[model samples]
Target: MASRILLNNGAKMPILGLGTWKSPPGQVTEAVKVAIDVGYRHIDCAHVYQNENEVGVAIQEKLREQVVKREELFIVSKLWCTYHEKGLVKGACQKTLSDLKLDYLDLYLIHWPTGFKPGKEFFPLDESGNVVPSDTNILDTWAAMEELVDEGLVKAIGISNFNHLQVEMILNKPGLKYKPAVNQIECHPYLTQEKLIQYCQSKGIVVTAYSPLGSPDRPWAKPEDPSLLEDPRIKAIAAKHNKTTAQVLIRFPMQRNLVVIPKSVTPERIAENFKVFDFELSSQDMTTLLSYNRNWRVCALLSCTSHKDYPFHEEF
Candidate 1:
């Protein structure tokens, strides 16, 4: 089995996990099954990713076969922006819970900070889910999330793709029942997200690095779009340790005490990505990797750019 780390709530998470975003719909089930058979115990997922039913069933079959247990897994899912409506939150989560057919989720994340009307895709949409609305916010929707923990529906609550300012909004809510257990972001060697990660850790929030392998496998994220694995500097560093660039990127965040999810559906790559726990890159190597931080981020909600506090365009 892979190693584990303690969360702020004292829940221990496996040091290595499997990520499923863009893992082809046809391959996700088999990929998940292969991951578990190879000893991966953590699986990060979200509704927007749209493969939950397949992934969930694969995990459930393993549980029934005694290959793993519900307690032995760390299952994470997120609440999407459209579901933030006062009346829609429960229904959305219920759909997830029902589709997943699981008793409880390990960690629940707010998928993004921005909230649109219940059916709209991003912001700028009307009641018919068409025309754009101006300045829809998420602070109140987060307060509703506090209600979930209060009702004992979820184990841990967290945020994903949130900037520091957005996190501050949720944390400062008076008398809120649950402070987010973690903050996940698009973290990698190229876009280290160091300041935000440091801030999250300082306040005792765990950090999860999505796209830690730099989203190399994303169908939409092409080789020409500021590729991380293609970066000669990263490849140059990885060769010194006899590691692949993807392995080196995962290791960087692991060394920094953040949980990393590198999405891959290929059985061989899944096993290889999970093998990162054994090697320790020297401090010099760590710094060498960090020095290549160019903040060349690829994950952004291009539709949400008009928001008042969008962090990507701000001078960092």
Candidate 2:
């Protein structure tokens, strides 16, 4: 069984989860079923993924077969950029709940600090092809998120891709009802995020490492981009430990006490990614891995740089 991390609200989240970002609708259901059968109790999902309906089928099937109970699973989903308005938060969350076929999510996150125009188009763009921005203040959105917990729609609420300043804003919000339980960010050897991770931990917020393998399959990936799974140093460490480089990458964040979610559709790879509990990465090995940090980010939302809450602008 996978180890678990305790959130501020006293809910324990599985340390490792199956990520469903690039997972296609036709394949995600099978992928999720395989993950559950392979002993994964956590699933990271988002409304923007557009395959929650398929993911729901897998979860329901597993439950009907008595493989896992609803309470035993730690399911998480995120509110999309277009649903940040105070009035739209619950509706968006309800849509996700109906699609996932769950009474309540273990955790729900604000997908991004930046918001888009709330309308039909997922990405509302101007005639210039730039994304149209929403003026919704995250604090207002957060206030609505807190109500989800109050009304029993979600067990916990958190943020994603938020920088330290943005996190501080939420923490320092007047009349804050509930503090964020986690802050999900892109973290890998290429983008170790040491300072940011330290800061969030100092504030009692559990940090979740997304794209822990450097997200080689991200849509914006270029041909010349460096692949983390193929890095020579990582391969050397894998050889020393008789493990795969992907295993080494996943274990790196685990040692730092951050939750990691590595997405895989292939059954073999999905099972391979979870076999990390038996071995340990030495302090020297961890130091070598951390040194590989060039501060490179693969999931950079560059188009939203003009948004007031664009988080990557901070030095941390």
Candidate 3:
């Protein structure tokens, strides 16, 4: 398998990355170390994850031991919802850099379409637990993102949780200095973002698939929630290739050229998720898997839907 995918900016981003959302401290530190040792050149992080410090420790140790040079690793961080003020953007990025202990980021993204009220609190919810949004426009936030690149803080900038029309809004912005290099979103067999991914690729924006394994462990997931890993259809495909269900799910999006990141802190599973280069899915299997798309989004930020910029309101 190709180690990486070429970005619109002519940068090479590893096709598989270790995702660090909800991965607790000591475990994540070890998980990242193992991922790096096992050949994950890309590490997906975000200021909102609140675990970058542990992840940074892993990266620092690897660099200290020469397991992998900084140049060989792609570190991605996101600007959180509470820092959308054009002035707060740089400060937020700098804070992430400090937490990650990295001089520059490979890619930085606006974490969500709606900007929360600028503050120290990550969520900043009101009494009803509804998200408090800000008056700042996303275009102004994008302007600040462009400045980060110009100031040499991040190699590239992009957006996350943004719909296709929202992407078009940015693409047609009055003074767009840089075309976003990526649009990271929740994607898998359950939520095959076909039209959105194609639209992004057409516009030179690479699409990164987060929670590619259906995020079975997400906190809000209820017992009744469907488990992609346990689905019979997916199991059949896995049996066909002698691979695990997770492997087939991770490879499905990758086979279509989408950057896929499957989060796992278990040492064995971490290694298992990376063992997908041995086989390719047949067209029949691909169609069968893609047919499972039920428009199910795992990370639906339902609380923030009241905001005007909620990205999922459209059919993207």
Candidate 4:
């Protein structure tokens, strides 16, 4: 099992989780089952993932089989952009809870700081092919999020893809109830995120690193894009440690005290990603990995860049 980190609300979250973004419906169920059987106690999910129902089926099966109980698993989900309205927050969470077949979520996050037009369509675009933006301020959305914790619908609340300034804004909000428990962002060697991580940690917010392996399978990945797994320097370090590049990538953020979720559907890879607790990356190896920082981002929300709350505009 992976190590656990304590949130501000006194809830413990597994340091590593199985990410389900872009995981196909038919395959995600088996993937969740394999991850649970392999000792993964945390599963990262979101309403936008569109496979929560299938993932829930696997969770139910594991529960019925007596592999793990609901309390033993730390399940997480995110509110999509369209549900940022104060009135829609609870319904969105309830939808995810219904699909996940859970009474309450371990943690829930504002998927992104930006909000899209609320409607039947997930991404409401205009004739100009730009996202239709909502006038909802994040403070109002956050207020509704605080209600989730107050009502016991979720154990903790946090933000995702938020920059340092944006995080500070929430911290400085008048009558703030709960400080953000975690900030999930795209982090890897190519985007080391040292400053932002330090800032968040200093503010008592645990930073969760997504796309730790650089998300080679991301939908918008270009043909000529650099692959972290194939990097010779990292491969050399992996060879030195007698481990796979993926293992090294997963271990990097773990060593830095950041929660990392590397998505994989293959049983071997899922198990392989979890074998990092036994190995230690030396200071020299850490320096070498940190030196590769190019500030590259894999999961940039390009379509929503025009949104008022787009976070990447600020430099951390």
- Tens digits of lDDT, candidate 4, 121-220: 8889999989999899989999999999999899999999999999999999999999999999989999999999999999889999999999988988
lDDT of 3 by residue, 122-215 (tens): 8898998999999999899999999999999999999999999999999999978999999999998889989999999999899999999888
Candidate 2: residue 242 Cα off by (Å): 0.5
For model 2, residues 73-110, the per-residue Cα lDDT tens digits are 99999999999898999999999999999989999999
TM-score on alpha carbons, each prediction: 0.92, 0.98, 0.98, 0.98
**In candidate 3, which residue pairs clash?**
none
lDDT of 1: 0.79
Candidate 2 similarity to native, TM-score:
0.98
The parts of candidate 1 lying over 4 Å away from their true place are 120-136
| lDDT string, candidate 1, 1-316, tens digits | 2377677767887767889887777899899999999988888888888888988888888998899888999988889777777677777776777766786888888887766555645445545544343244666677777777767667788888888877787788777667789888888877888888888898888899988877766656764677777889888878987888888888888899888888888889888877776678889988877877887776777766765645567533
